[PDB]
C-alpha cells in the first residue's frame, strides 16, 4: 500500500478551514483537520512545502512510524504549527486505517464505552437579563450543560460575549479589568442557579485573565454554585501556577485548549492540579498523541473535555466524537455549532439528539469534504483579538 | 455481533498452558493465554465460574467496556489471578477485532515501528567454564543478547542454573547465600567480557534476592562490564526500594515480570528509577493495559523488556511480538524457547532469524490452538521453587 | 506436631461462605474464613489445588514460616485470591495455636485492651422519610453508631439502599449520577442531625464513586454534621488521590475494605491521609498481616475500622472481634448482621449487648463449623453489581 | 515614528536564509534572522501572512509592547515557527533602536563586559586518525576550544561527521547504535588528550541519542578528560530527565539549541541541572527573551553557550556577538563558519582574531543584507536527516 498523493484544501464557508486529504494507490483516502485559527497559512506551508513531499510513496498503514518521523524529525519539536500539521496527517491516516478495516474509527480504538456523548453549548449575554435569556434558549435546544459568559459593568467587551472571536482582518483590541470582573461574575452564577436550579451543569471560561491567587479567590466565590468547571483560569506555561489555585478551592478546574503536547500538561495532570484536560486532536498531534494524553490523565482522575469551538472543523469534530465514544475517562464535549454553510462543505455521520452526540457508523471518522463546494469560498484573513488592560498593558485574551 | 461460546483449554505438552477461546456468532474466534505458573487452576476457575458466564451474548467489539467491566466489576481489584483471567479475555478480543479487520494485530495498534525485534536467550552453567560454553552455544544460535547465570561456589542451587523452574509436584527448596553470590558474580562477567568482547549484549537476573544497598553494591561492581540490564534486583512491593539503587549505580535496571497492574510500577517509572519494564500481556490485563503501561513508560525514557519464559505460552508470545513490532519504546523481547511438543499445540505465524523475530502477517495475533492435540496432554501439577537462606529463613526465590 | 488433613467446606445458608479446616495429628483443629464475595470458587481452587497439598505434614505451630512460604512462594505476590487463601490458613493456624495454649485468641495477641467493642449498623432508606425511620430502628436495636445511606432523587438504585449486594446469578447493572448525589446527600445528614441530635455517631460510605476534588467538596459539605467517617470516597489504587481530599476537609476519612496488602495502604497511612483503615483479616492475609497493618497505623494516629459486611463469615467475625479486643488503636467494628440460617452453620462464642461486642472466652477464636448442617446448602452463584453512569460508562460500584 | 514597510527576503547562497527587514518613515531600517532550518517557508508565511500586516503603522520604538502583542496575541503560544518569526521582528527592532541611538547594540544592552568573545570550532573525522588531524587543523586556525566528533566503528554515519547536516531535498536516513558509541567514544577523548594536552578546551555533542542513565555512564567515562561540556545528552521535553544525569557525573552539561522559550528550560536552570544554556536569539524570540533567559540563568551559575551552526545566519551571529559582548554570564560562542558566498550576502562588522570575536562598532547589530546579491540565489529545499536504530526504530537525530 502506498500514498500516491496528498493535498491541502483551504476554504472559507463563513470562516477559514484547512483540510489535508491523503490518497492511497487503491483509491481509499483519508482526511484530517489542519486549521490553526488566525495563523492558518503557516500550517498550509508546513504541510505543502515540507511534510507532504515526504509522505508520498510511504505505506499509510505505518501510522506510528510516520508520527514519530515527523514529531522527532522536524528537529525543532512541538509547537502549534508543526503539531497541527502532524495532527492532520495522523487523523487522515487513522481515517484510512479504519476504512481499510471497514469499521467506524471508534471500533479501532477499542470500541464504544458509552451510548451517547454529553456536550455543552454557549450562553452569552451583554448583561445579566440577556445572559439569563441565553441560558433559557440553550436549555430549550436540549443542552444539559451550558457555558455561561456575561458582559461586565464598566467593561466594553469581554470574552465570549453569533459570537465568533476571529472577527477582523487584523486583531481587534479588547479592554479588560480584572477587579471589575471578580466583583461581578459570582452574582451572575447566583442568578443562574436561582432561576434554573441545581440540576443543569454550568461551566465558565475565565479565558486566561487572572493570576493564581485571583483564580483561587474566584474559585472559592463560585463554590456555592457547584460549577462543572472553571476553565483556563491563568496562563499555564508555568504549570506550577495551578498548585496555588488547587490549594484554595474545590471548584473543578479545566485547562488546555491551547496546548499542543503532553509536555504542556504532564505536571498539571500527575500532580492532580486539574480535573479536565481540554487539549484537542487537531492542535496536539492527532489521535495518536491524544490517546496517550487521555490514558495518562486517567491514572490521576483527570477526564477529557475537548475544546469544540467553531475553528475546529467538522473533520476535527468527527474524529473527536469517535474518540469520545471509546475513551474510558470521557468528561464532556464542547459544541459551538457550525453554520449550515460550514456543514455543507463537510458531509458527516455524527448526529445530535437532546444534548448528546453519537459519532455515526460510517467507516473511518465518518467525515468527508466536498471539494467542488469548498472551492467556491476563497480564504479570507481573520485574526483573533488581543486584550489590553485599562492602562494599555498588553494582557492575555 | 455476539459471543456465543467461550471455553478454557488446559493442556500439558511438557508444561501446563491454559488458553481461553472466544467464539462469535459469525464463526470468527479469538484466543488468549491464561497461564499463571504454579497456580494455573485458580485462573481456570476464575474464568469458568465467574467471567465466561458474563461474556456470553456480549458484542466482542466492545473491548474497552468489557475490560473495565471485569477490572472494576470484580470489586476486589488487580491481583495475579484476576488480571491473568482478564488478560486472556482481552487478548482473545483483540485477536477477534484484528481478524474482523483482516489485519495482523500490529496494524491495529498503529502499524510497525521496526523491521525486526531483538531478543535475548539464556546461558546457564553450573560453574564458570560451563557458563562460558553456554554463552558460546547461545551466540552460535544467532543471539545478539544473552542472559548469563552461573552457579555460585558454596551454593548448591541458584536461580537460572534444560532449565525449567517449575520442577516438581510440590515446591523444591533451594538454599541461598547473598554474600557468596555478591563476592563471586562480578568475576563471571569479567570472564565473559574477556572471552567474548564488548559488542555482545549481556543481561543478568538477580531474581529478587538482594536488599537495596546490596543491589547498589552489585550494580557498581558490574559497571565495568556494561550490562544491558540488571533485573529484579530487590522485591518491589515498596517501589521506593529502587531509589537507593538508582542513587548509586549507572548499571541499567529492569523489573516487573511479576506485576499485574500499572499501579505496581507507576512510581518506579515516573521517578525514572528503572530503565526497562518487564510486565507482560498475559499477567497484567492484556494488550489494553500493556499499551497504557508502555505509553506511560515512554514519557520517562523507560523501554519495554517483556518477560518471555516458557510459562508464557506461544499465544502470549504471538501477542507480545505484534505489540513489540508496533510499540515505539521497544527495548528487547526475552526468548526462552518452547519445545517442539509445546509448539505443535500452538501453530503460529511468528518466526526467528539471526537473533530477531517478526510477528507474521496472518490476521489476528497469528496464533491458534490445535484442540485435538491439546487434549492428548492432561494437566500435571508443577509448582515453582521456594528459596531459604542458610539458617532456614524463607527468602525470595 | 503435624497437619494431617485440611479441607475446604463450601456452603450457602442464605449466601456463599467458604471455610478452611486444618486438622492436626492430635485431633485439635482450626478454621479460617476463605470467602471472596462473587469470586468464591477461585479461592477454593487456590487452596485445594495448590496450598493444601503443601500444608500436609507441616508443623502447624510454624505460623510465620508458613505465612512467608505462601506469601513469597507464590511468586506472583499479593492479590485478592491468593491473600484470601492465605488468610484462611493463617486464621486456622492461630485458632490451633490458641487451642494448644488453652486460651482465647485475644490472650495470645497480648490480652484485652478494652472491656467491650463498639460496633455500627446500617440504616438504609429509599427516600429521606424512610431513611429517618431506619435510623430510629437501628437506634432501637441499641447501636450507638449508624451508617446512613439514602436513595437519591433522579437515581433508581444507589449503594447500600434486607440489603445484600450480591443479588444475582450475573451482575446487576446500577445507574449513577455523581452530581445528583452531591447536591442531595448533605440534606440527608442535616435531617438526621435535626431529628437525632449530636451524640449518635454517623457514618457514610461513598462507595468509590467520586473524584478527589468531588470528595473534597462532599467532605466540606458534611463537616457541620461531624461524621465519624466518610468512607471509600475515591478508588484508591493511586494512593496519592487522598492527598487532595485531606488538603480540603476535616471530615474524618476511612478506606480499605478492598485491599489485600499493607502495600495497598502504606502511603495512605504514613502520610496521615486517612483516619481509619478498613482492611480485613479474611481479605488481607489473616491475623499475621493485620497485626502489622494495625501496628503500622498506630504510629500515624490511624485506627482500625474493620469491614463487617455479611460476606465476611462468622469465622472472620470471631477472629476480628478477638483482634479488636486486644489491638490498642481500635476504632470501630462494622456489623451487618448475619441471618439465623447463617449463624446456625457457625456456632460461635462472640456476643452483642447494647451496641457492643465481646469475643467470648472459648479457646481459639471461638468459632466452629457444623459440617453436617453446612452440607444441606449447596453453593449458588451470586455476583456483585456493576455501576454505569447515565451515558453507559462503566463506573465504580 | 512609524513602520512603513516590512518584507521577508529568502536567499540560498549555499544554504537557505530567511531575513526580515523593517523600514521606518525616516528611512532607518533594521534586519533580523528568521531562518528555521528545514521548515523555512513556514516562518516566511507566519511573517508575511499574519505578523507583517500588523506591524505596519506601529511605532518601532515599542519593542516590549510589540513582543508581548505577538507572543500572547497568537493565542497558540511558543513553538519553533512563531518564536522564530517573533525573533526576526524583535532583532530588527533592536537594530533600529540602536541605530536611532547611534550606538552599537551591545551599548544599549548595558555595555561591554569583556574585551573579546571566546568561540569554539568543529573538528570531525570519519575515524580516530582523521579526527586527530581535524583537531590539529582547528588548533592551527587559532581556536582555543574545539568540538570533537568521530565516526564510530560499525556505524556508517553519525552526528557531526564540509559537514552541513541539511544535506538533501528530503531527509537522509542515518543509522545508529547507542552501545557501539558508548563503548568507543571515551577512547577518542583519551587519544585527543594524549596528543594535545590539558589546556585546549574540548566539547562533545551527544545529539539527543541517549537515555539519562546512558548519559550518566558517558559523563562518568569522560570525566578524566575534563570536557568543557557534554551537550544535548538526552531529549529534554521532560526536563526532569537531567536530574539523573546530574546525580551521577561532574562532566559539565549543556543543552537547548532546539528550545524556543524560557518555559523549555526553567526547571533545568533553577534546579542547577545544567551548566550552559544553548538557546539562541533567532529560535527563541530574539534579544528580548534571551536577555531574560540569560539573566535567569545567572542566578543559578548557568552560563550562555549559544548554538552557532551555519543555519543561523550572519544576522543572528551579529546579534549574538553584541549580546555576548555585554552579558555577564557569558560562557562561549559556537562558530561553525559561513562560506564566502554566504558572507557576501550579509556584510557585517563582527571580526575574528586568534579564537575570539568582537561584535564591531557600527550602530545597530552591524549586519546588513545585500538585496541585489541575495536575489541571485533562489530558495532550494533542504531538510535535516532523521536517525533510525539498527532495527529501523525512528530515533532522535
Ligand atoms: Cl510552531
Ligand atoms: Cl489474585
Ligand atoms: Mg476556552
Ligand atoms: Mg526474571
Ligand atoms: Mg464500604
Ligand atoms: Mg548541538
Round to whole Å and give the CA distance between B229 and B216. Answer: 13
Cell of residue D54, nine digits: 500588523
Q: Among the residues of chain D, which ranges form H helices? A: 40-45, 52-55, 63-73, 80-101, 105-109, 128-140, 178-196, 212-222, 241-248, 266-270, 286-298, 314-326, 340-345, 371-374
> Closest residue of C to B83, CA-based?
C79
The helix-helix angle for B128-140 and B178-196 (nearest 10°) equals: 50
Nearest to A285 by CA among A77, A8, A55, A54: A77
Coil, strand, or helix at residue D281?
coil
Cell of residue A247, nine digits: 490549594
Inter-residue contact C73 to C271 (CB < 8 Å): no
Give the pairing of strands C117-125 and C145-150. parallel
Query: A87 vs A35, A166, A255, B49, D116, CA distance in Å?
Result: 10, 22, 20, 46, 47
| Residue B236: HSE in the Cβ half-sphere, 13 Å Cα cutoff | 34
Query: D277 vs A313, B209, D244, D258, CA distance in Å?
Result: 40, 43, 18, 11
Which residue(s) pair with B36 in the sheet?
none
> Closest residue of B to C266, CA-based?
B238
Nearest to C47 by CA among C14, C15, C13, C92: C92
DSSP letter string, D329-348: TB--EE--PPPHHHHHHS-B
What residues contact residue C295 under an 8 Å CB cut-off, 6+ apart? none
User: Cα torsion at C34, C36, C40, C42 (round to 10°)?
Assistant: -80
**Cα angle at D106 between D102 and D109, to 5 degrees?**
100
Query: A236 vs A255, A267, B74, C322, CA distance in Å?
Result: 8, 11, 39, 55
Inter-residue contact D290 to D280 (CB < 8 Å): yes
Query: B160 vs B179, B309, D295, CA distance in Å?
Result: 18, 11, 57
Round to whole Å and give the CA distance between B279 and B264. Answer: 10
Q: Is B2 on the interface with C (CB under 8 A)?
A: no
CB atoms within 10 A of CB A173: 16
CB atoms within 10 A of CB B233: 30
Round to whole Å and give the CA distance between D252 and A225. Answer: 54
Name the residues of A annotated as catalytic.
159, 207
Coil, strand, or helix at residue C350?
coil
Coil, strand, or helix at residue A75?
coil
Cell of residue C322, nine digits: 478477638
> Closest residue of D to B117, CA-based?
D391
The residue of C213, C218, C220, C245 whose CB has the most chain A CBs within 10 angstroms, and thus the best one to mutate to test that interface, is C213
The helix-helix angle for B80-101 and B63-73 (nearest 10°) equals: 170
What is the CA(B147)–ligand 4 centre distance, in A?
10
| Residue located via cell numbers 508581548 | D68
Give the pairing of strands C276-277 and B351-353. unpaired
| Residue A138: HSE in the Cβ half-sphere, 13 Å Cα cutoff | 29
Give the pairing of strands A351-353 and A117-125. unpaired
Inter-residue contact D338 to D16 (CB < 8 Å): no
Round to whole Å and give the CA distance between C113 and C118. Answer: 13
Cell of residue D243, nine digits: 536530574
Round to whole Å and give the CA distance between A42 and A27. Answer: 29
CB atoms within 10 A of CB A320: 29
Give the pairing of strands D229-231 and D253-255. parallel
The torsion angles phi and psi of D214, rounded to 5 degrees, stand at -70, -40
Inter-residue contact A281 to A323 (CB < 8 Å): yes
Which residue(s) pair with A174 in the sheet?
A387
Cell of residue D41, nine digits: 517557508
Query: What single-letter DSSP state applies at residue A168?
Result: B
Biggest alpha carbon distance in chain D?
62
Query: A114 vs A99, A110, A118, A360, B64, CA distance in Å?
Result: 22, 12, 10, 13, 10
Burial class (CB in 10 A: 0-12, 13-18, 19+), C117: buried
Nearest to A118 by CA among A286, A256, A393, A303: A303
Inter-residue contact B175 to B94 (CB < 8 Å): no
Backbone breaks in chain C after residues (C–N over 2.5 Å) = 161
Ligand 6 ion: nearby residues, β-carbon < 5 Å: D 205
Please name the residues between 35 and 74 in chain A that touch chain D, using a CB distance below 8 Å: 36-39, 41-46, 49-50, 53-54, 65, 68-69, 72-74
Q: Is D394 on the interface with B (CB under 8 A)?
A: yes
The torsion angles phi and psi of C234, rounded to 5 degrees, stand at -135, 150
Nearest to A236 by CA among A185, A291, A279: A279
The helix-helix angle for D80-101 and D286-298 (nearest 10°) equals: 100
How many helices (H) and strands (E) would you count in chain B?
14, 16
**Cα angle at C312 between C307 and C317, to 5 degrees?**
80
Is D201 designated active site? Answer: no
Which residue(s) pair with C3 in the sheet?
C24
| Nearest beta carbon to residue B75 from set C79, C82, C397 | C397
Cell of residue D122, nine digits: 568543529
The helix-helix angle for C63-73 and C286-298 (nearest 10°) equals: 90
DSSP letter string, C264-307: GTHHHHHTT--SEE---TTTTTHHHHHHHHHHHHHTTT-EE---
Round to whole Å and give the CA distance between B115 and A281. Answer: 29
Nearest to B222 by CA among B252, B178, B255, B254: B252
Query: D16 vs C171, D19, D36, D79, CA distance in Å?
Result: 67, 10, 9, 20
- Whether residue C42 and residue B37 make contact (CB cut-off 8 A), yes or no, is no
| Residue located via cell numbers 467493642 | C117
Q: Is D115 on the interface with A (CB under 8 A)?
A: no
DSSP letter string, A305-339: -----TTS-HHHHHHHHHHHHH-TTB--EE--PPP
The torsion angles phi and psi of D92, rounded to 5 degrees, stand at -60, -35
Inter-residue contact A145 to A355 (CB < 8 Å): yes
| Nearest beta carbon to residue C238 from set A113, A117, A299 | A299
Displacement of CA D263 from its chain's centroid (Å): 18
Coil, strand, or helix at residue B174?
strand
Is D159 designated active site? Answer: yes
Round to whole Å and give the CA distance between B150 and B127. Answer: 6
Round to whole Å and give the CA distance between A25 and A23. Answer: 7
Query: What single-letter DSSP state applies at residue B169?
Result: S
Round to whole Å and give the CA distance between B331 and B65. Answer: 30
| Residue located via cell numbers 516438581 | B168
Nearest to A97 by CA among A135, A70, A53, A67: A67
- Whether residue C183 and residue A201 make contact (CB cut-off 8 A), yes or no, is no
**Cα angle at A277 between A271 and A280, to 5 degrees?**
140
Structure-determination technique: X-ray
Sign of CA dihedral A83, A88, A89, A91: positive
Cell of residue A47, nine digits: 504541510
Give the pairing of strands A117-125 and A333-334. parallel
Cell of residue C325, nine digits: 479486643
CB atoms within 10 A of CB C64: 12
Query: B260 vs A66, B255, B290, B334, D22, CA distance in Å?
Result: 31, 12, 10, 18, 62
How many helices (H) and strands (E) would you count in chain C?
14, 16
Sign of CA dihedral D47, D51, D56, D57: negative
Across C358-376, b (16+ Cβ under 10 Å) vs e yields bbbebbbbbbbbeeeebee
Inter-residue contact C276 to C253 (CB < 8 Å): yes
Round to whole Å and give the CA distance between C316 and D218. Answer: 57
Displacement of CA D233 from its chain's centroid (Å): 16
Element (H, E) at C20: strand C17-24
Element (H, E) at B190: helix B178-196
Cell of residue B205, nine digits: 537476573
Round to whole Å and give the CA distance between D212 and D248. Answer: 10
**A–D CB contacts, 8 A cutoff, strictly below:** 149
| Residue located via cell numbers 508546513 | A46
What residues contact residue D341 under an 8 Å CB cut-off, 6+ apart? D13, D14
* Structural domains of chain D in order of their starting residue, each with its CATH number: 1-104+362-397 (3.30.390.10), 105-361 (3.20.20.120)
Round to whole Å and give the CA distance between A283 and A288. Answer: 12
| Residue located via cell numbers 476537609 | C249
Query: What single-letter DSSP state applies at residue B383?
Result: B
- Whether residue B300 and residue D238 make contact (CB cut-off 8 A), yes or no, is yes
The residue of B113, B242, B249, B272 whose CB has the most chain D CBs within 10 angstroms, and thus the best one to mutate to test that interface, is B272
Cell of residue B116, nine digits: 525486526
Query: What single-letter DSSP state applies at residue B224?
Result: G
Inter-residue contact B282 to B33 (CB < 8 Å): yes
Amino acid at each position: 500500500m502506498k500514498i500516491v498523493d496528498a493535498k491541502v484544501i483551504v476554504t472559507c464557508p463563513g470562516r477559514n478551514f484547512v483540510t489535508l486529504k491523503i490518497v492511497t494507490d487503491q483509491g481509499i483516502y483519508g482526511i484530517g483537520d489542519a486549521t490553526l485559527n488566525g495563523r492558518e497559512k503557516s500550517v498550509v506551508s508546513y504541510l505543502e512545502d515540507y511534510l507532504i513531499p515526504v509522505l508520498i510513496g510511504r505505506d499509510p498503514q505505518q501510522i506510528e512510524d510516520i508520527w514519530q518521523f515527523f514529531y522527532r524529525g522536524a528537529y525543532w519539536r512541538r509547537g502549534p504549527v508543526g503539531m497541527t500539521a502532524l495532527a492532520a496527517i495522523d487523523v487522515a491516516l487513522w481515517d484510512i486505517k479504519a476504512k481499510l478495516a471497514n469499521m467506524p474509527l471508534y471500533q479501532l480504538l477499542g470500541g464504544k464505552s458509552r451510548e451517547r456523548i454529553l456536550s455543552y453549548t454557549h450562553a452569552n449575554g451583554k448583561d445579566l437579563d440577556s445572559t439569563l435569556e441565553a441560558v433559557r434558549k440553550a436549555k430549550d435546544k436540549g443542552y444539559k450543560a451550558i457555558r455561561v459568559q456575561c458582559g461586565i459593568p464598566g467593561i466594553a467587551k469581554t470574552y465570549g460575549v453569533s459570537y465568533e472571536p476571529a472577527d477582523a482582518d487584523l486583531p481587534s483590541v479588547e479592554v479588560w479589568s480584572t477587579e471589575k470582573y471578580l466583583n461581578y461574575i459570582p452574582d451572575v452564577f447566583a442568578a443562574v442557579r436561582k432561576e434554573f436550579g441545581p440540576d443543569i451543569h454550568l461551566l465558565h471560561d475565565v479565558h486566561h485573565r487572572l493570576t493564581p491567587i485571583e483564580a483561587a479567590r474566584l474559585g472559592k466565590a463560585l463554590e456555592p454554585y457547584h460549577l462543572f468547571w472553571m476553565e483556563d483560569a491563568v496562563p499555564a506555561e508555568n504549570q506550577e501556577s495551578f498548585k496555588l489555585i488547587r490549594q484554595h478551592t474545590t471548584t473543578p478546574l479545566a485547562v488546555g485548549e491551547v496546548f499542543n503536547s503532553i509536555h504542556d500538561c504532564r505536571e498539571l495532570i500527575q500532580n492532580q492540579w486539574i480535573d479536565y484536560i481540554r487539549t484537542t486532536i487537531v492542535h496536539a498531534g492527532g489521535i495518536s498523541q491524544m490517546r496517550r494524553i487521555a490514558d495518562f490523565a486517567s491514572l490521576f482522575h483527570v477526564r477529557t473535555g475537548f475544546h469544540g469551538a467553531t475553528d475546529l472543523s467538522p473533520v476535527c469534530m468527527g474524529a473527536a466524537l469517535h474518540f469520545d465514544y471509546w475513551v474510558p475517562n470521557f468528561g464532556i464535549q464542547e459544541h459551538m455549532a457550525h453554520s449550515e454553510q460550514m456543514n455543507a462543505v463537510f458531509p458527516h455521520a455524527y448526529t445530535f439528539n437532546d444534548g448528546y452526540f453519537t459519532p455515526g457508523e460510517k467507516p473511518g471518522h465518518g467525515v468527508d469534504i466536498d471539494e467542488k463546494l469548498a472551492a467556491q469560498y476563497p480564504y479570507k484573513r481573520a485574526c483573533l483579538p488581543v486584550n489590553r488592560l485599562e492602562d494599555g498593558t498588553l494582557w492575555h485574551w
